[PDB]
Design a protein around this ligand. Structure first.
Ligand SMILES: [Mg+2]
Ligand SMILES: [Mg+2]
Ligand SMILES: [Mg+2]
Ligand SMILES: [Mg+2]
Ligand SMILES: [Mg+2]
Ligand SMILES: [Mg+2]
Ligand SMILES: [Mg+2]
Ligand SMILES: [Mg+2]
Ligand SMILES: [Mg+2]
Ligand SMILES: [Mg+2]
Ligand SMILES: [Mg+2]
Ligand SMILES: [Mg+2]
Ligand SMILES: [Mg+2]
Ligand SMILES: [Mg+2]
Ligand SMILES: [Mg+2]
Ligand SMILES: [Mg+2]
Ligand SMILES: [Mg+2]
Ligand SMILES: [Mg+2]
Ligand SMILES: [Mg+2]
Ligand SMILES: [Mg+2]
Ligand SMILES: [Mg+2]
Ligand SMILES: [Mg+2]
Ligand SMILES: [Mg+2]
Ligand SMILES: [Mg+2]
Ligand SMILES: [Mg+2]
Ligand SMILES: [Mg+2]
Ligand SMILES: [Mg+2]
Ligand SMILES: [Mg+2]
Ligand SMILES: [Mg+2]
Ligand SMILES: [Mg+2]
Ligand SMILES: [Mg+2]
Ligand SMILES: [Mg+2]
Ligand SMILES: [Mg+2]
Ligand SMILES: [Mg+2]
Ligand SMILES: [Mg+2]
Ligand SMILES: [Mg+2]
Ligand SMILES: [Mg+2]
Ligand SMILES: [Mg+2]
Ligand SMILES: [Mg+2]
Lengths: 88, 52, 118, 50
RNA sequence: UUGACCUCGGAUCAGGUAGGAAUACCCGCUGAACUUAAGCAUAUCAAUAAGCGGAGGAAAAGAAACCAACAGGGAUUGCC
RNA sequence: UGGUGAGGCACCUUCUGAGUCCCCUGGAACGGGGCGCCAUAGAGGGUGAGAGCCCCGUAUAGUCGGAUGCCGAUCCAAUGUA
RNA sequence: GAGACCGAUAGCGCACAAGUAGAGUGAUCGAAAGAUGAAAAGCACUUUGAAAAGAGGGUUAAAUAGCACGUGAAAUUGUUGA
RNA sequence: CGUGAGCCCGGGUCGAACGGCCUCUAGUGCAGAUCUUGGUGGUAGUAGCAAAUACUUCAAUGAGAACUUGAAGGACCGAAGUGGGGAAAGGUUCCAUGUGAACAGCGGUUGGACAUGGGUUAGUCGAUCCUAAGCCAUAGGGAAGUUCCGUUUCAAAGGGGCAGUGCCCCGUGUGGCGAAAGGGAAGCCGGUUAACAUUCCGGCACCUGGAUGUGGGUUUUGCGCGGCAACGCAACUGAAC
RNA sequence: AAUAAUUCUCACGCCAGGUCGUACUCAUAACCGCAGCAGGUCUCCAAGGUGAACAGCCUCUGGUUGAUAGAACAAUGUAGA
RNA sequence: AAACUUUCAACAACGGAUCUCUUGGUUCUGGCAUCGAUGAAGAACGCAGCGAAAUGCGAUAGGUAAUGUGAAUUGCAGAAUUCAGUGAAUCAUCGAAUCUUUGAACGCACAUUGCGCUCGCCAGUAUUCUGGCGAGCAUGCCUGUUCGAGCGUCAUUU
């Protein structure tokens, strides 16, 4: 009775949602994420899974701030206004 | 409820005796504002709100 | 326009009447949202953003004037760059040199010379 | 359940607004390839995974 | 009694700094077995993969307690 | 020891050649035939089919400009503590 | 910026709302899917049908291009003919 | 045409590129690998669609009715139910209106399907508060390190009063998480919607916290009387420990 | 306190009570089993008769009449004899 | 003889091969060095006239300011006063800003939109209670400041 009968007793929800990665991988009893390892400061990732790093790497999100860094450098980190703009 | 009650006073000048709030399944918030018995809510909705 | 406000007109205002403009603009957008449930709302939304930006611009410009001759400025007014650049040694500290080294530079520096001319 | 744990109730609100068909006027946009909502979810088909 | 000195503390005291990301290349630590030996244990794979710590546009090394044995070369790095 | 800087680099930015000539096929010539032009430009792409001359660009400089900081070619200033 | 490279079962897993849809408690695993036409000009109107549609009729160079859309092989199938 | 791999031509479809010759080059030739991916057969209109007793008549709707609806009859669950509620889990499946295709392994006018709208109201219910088994910080000690142990230790650990500082008093000892079934302050009746109700409406209450007035009680040798007693009465001061 | 104080553990009077959940199923169709699967999944309320009895059998309140159907009645079956 | 079975052709099916293409990949070469407690990478939730996704953005939300260009966007009305415009656009540039909840994540926690403390302002008879708004409260380490502790210790008074 390890098959169809035993799957009916399965309503316990071992893993819950994680605050850091948003995956349903936060172990409820250990309070440790199985994906990003979040009781801790350092995000979890290993070199034996190239796909796992690829899914989590820097180019996979919005890049709310790094997308502007490239443009700031190309102009040499300017400050001020373009030589007589309207309004102070 | 404290913010909602004070907002109605400053916005439409509405005096309420109690407010019951909801969070609808779509994610927004509903607020049933019970007006004081000395004012006509139907009259207010016509002029201040335009809900006529 | 009808709901649009031109940036040039607001630049000539002051903080007091810009706030009065802001409050009056917000009131209309509230009434127009009610009427919507029962295109100018887009004009009002941008007008509110336009007024808020200019009010903030006047605040920070005046603040920068106040902290002109102050050693410590708020982190909002401090120039933002890469933090690595902020940790960098200053020009005065980078250009500072030992006293003995300067004595070997004032006398015996690199000379402008040439060969095969005698 | 009826005990919702507001964070969870916030995800359920997101899931039902996302479960809509595509507006008709998108299918006419001079270079459109969108034809039907390929991310449609039904409670009898796929689990939200909360 | 007061005033020093030494050591050890408090403070939402004044001003600062560190962590995380990234790690293709770089500096270290730690560290296998598959495999080859027609078996296998030293050996080999390999002072490699995985794991951990730390930087930069390069890093590291670097101005001889060097090489030589010559009529002597003369910091480091890289190619033949 | 201070000074004064040509320009010559490094930055971007505007501008710079020549057919839509005639006939046939074709839904449409960017095809075929004839007559021409530009080329320091016949790289590339688009335009209703294989387009140097229809359009963007392409080849040489030199001009419409302006931001900053690097270097020197002429010239003029001085002075000795220690 | 290029190529004696690959050309939609190839080339990266991804030429497309691709690390997406989906699977797993989880660590993780992970696809398929490009092409009407120059231009939607994407079939007005009449008639049969409850309707989907059909038959006329019309657009186009072409519907032997009708959105199940460039060409349309074979396996397999229907009608006609031998 | 050639012994052959193949080459060439005619006819039909099609709409934008392609070929011969000499050299150079390679991801260069398929019948198989229980080969890979995609597609398609015979079997085959075949096996089958047979547990949970069971349906029938009339009428309406509709193009169409065994499985839509109303009425009538016949039955079953037979209160450890095929009933009325919930915990976990699910997430809009709830309600109204409408419907071509697909789904409901027969049909479908019907639907947990599809399309558009609507729907969940709390001082009193629960979470929130407490601690349990247990988990994690702090002081410290290991470990090359990711980190491991430690939960009161070999720690100068905290908590309040008076007028942003001053002055006092105590200290044995000084954190957090962990139960929608444990502990726990307090709400009942009637009515109401297509869909909510101890939550809305009407009436009638209760608890906690904070302010603060009147009445009453006590007191002119300052903090109540009665009963033998068990105890009673509307009050009837009470700091640290 | 003797000229007014005082217990605001007596009565009445005054003000306020924030945040989140709340629909629906809870199963022979809303959960898990690839599914509208004879499986599995915690609990409360529990009528009448017979009968020792939440045994079996019949009925009330409440709920269903849902499981592809029609016609024949060969062999061989499955279940009841 | 028909039916059925088998073979071929035409047409019609099923299927998506072949041909041609290509805003994609791959490899090589050249140049550059720029994340973050002044809050990064990532995550969640929201924002459009009519949007589900993608892209973009953050309550100033398919975006504002500034500069340049110079008459659009486009699936429909909506901008026609924006036509000298003192200026359209899902434009380009980008030096000023905004930047919800989180996250190294920093008051303590978080399976909770939970529980706190300090200051200031406003309202309720209020220094103590309640509500609104704003600014704050992590750890380690460094320099200094100030307040201390120790018969560790010096001198004097005593
Ligand atoms: Mg169990
Ligand atoms: Mg509520
Ligand atoms: Mg061996
Ligand atoms: Mg061997
Ligand atoms: Mg062996
Ligand atoms: Mg390694
Ligand atoms: Mg170095
Ligand atoms: Mg054709
Ligand atoms: Mg065609
Ligand atoms: Mg075709
Ligand atoms: Mg065939
Ligand atoms: Mg063509
Ligand atoms: Mg090959
Ligand atoms: Mg082949
Ligand atoms: Mg083959
Ligand atoms: Mg085979
Ligand atoms: Mg049969
Ligand atoms: Mg059977
Ligand atoms: Mg019972
Ligand atoms: Mg029940
Ligand atoms: Mg229903
Ligand atoms: Mg069916
Ligand atoms: Mg049917
Ligand atoms: Mg520990
Ligand atoms: Mg607790
Ligand atoms: Mg409890
Ligand atoms: Mg109900
Ligand atoms: Mg009431
Ligand atoms: Mg008495
Ligand atoms: Mg409810
Ligand atoms: Mg309910
Ligand atoms: Mg329910
Ligand atoms: Mg039930
Ligand atoms: Mg299921
Ligand atoms: Mg499963
Ligand atoms: Mg009896
Ligand atoms: Mg019985
Ligand atoms: Mg059956
Ligand atoms: Mg033969």
């Amino acid at each position: 009775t390890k098959g169809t009968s035993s799957f009916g007793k399965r309503h316990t929800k071992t893993h819950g949602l994680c605050r850091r990665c948003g995956r349903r991988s936060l172990h409820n009893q250990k309070k440790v994420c199985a994906s990003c390892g979040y009781p801790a400061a350092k995000t979890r990732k290993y070199n034996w899974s190239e796909k796992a790093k690829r899914r989590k790497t820097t180019g996979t999100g919005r890049l709310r701030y790094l997308s502007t860094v490239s443009r700031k450098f190309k102009n040499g980190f300017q400050t001020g206004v373009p030589k007589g703009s309207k309004g102070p | 409820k404290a913010q909602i009650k004070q907002a109605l006073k400053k916005l439409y000048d509405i005096d309420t005796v109690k407010i019951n709030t909801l969070i609808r399944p779509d994610g927004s918030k509903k607020a049933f504002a019970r007006l004081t018995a000395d004012v006509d809510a139907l009259d207010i909705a016509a002029t201040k709100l335009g809900l006529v | 326009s009808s709901g649009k406000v031109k940036a040039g007109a607001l630049w000539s205002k002051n903080k007091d009447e810009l706030t009065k403009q802001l409050g009056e603009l917000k009131t209309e957008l509230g009434q127009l949202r009610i009427q919507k449930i029962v295109n100018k709302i887009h004009d009002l939304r941008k007008s509110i953003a336009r007024v808020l930006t200019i009010i903030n611009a006047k605040q920070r410009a005046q603040l920068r004037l106040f902290y002109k001759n102050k050693k410590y400025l708020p982190l909002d007014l401090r120039a933002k760059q890469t933090r690595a650049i902020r940790r960098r040694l200053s020009k005065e500290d980078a250009s500072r040199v030992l006293e003995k080294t300067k004595k070997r530079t004032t006398h015996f520096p690199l000379r402008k010379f040439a060969v095969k001319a005698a | 359940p009826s005990h919702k744990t507001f964070r969870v109730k916030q995800k359920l609100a997101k899931a039902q607004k996302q479960n809509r068909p595509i507006p008709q006027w998108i299918r006419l946009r001079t270079g459109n390839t969108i034809r039907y909502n390929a991310k449609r979810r039904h409670w009898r088909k796929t689990r939200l995974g909360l």
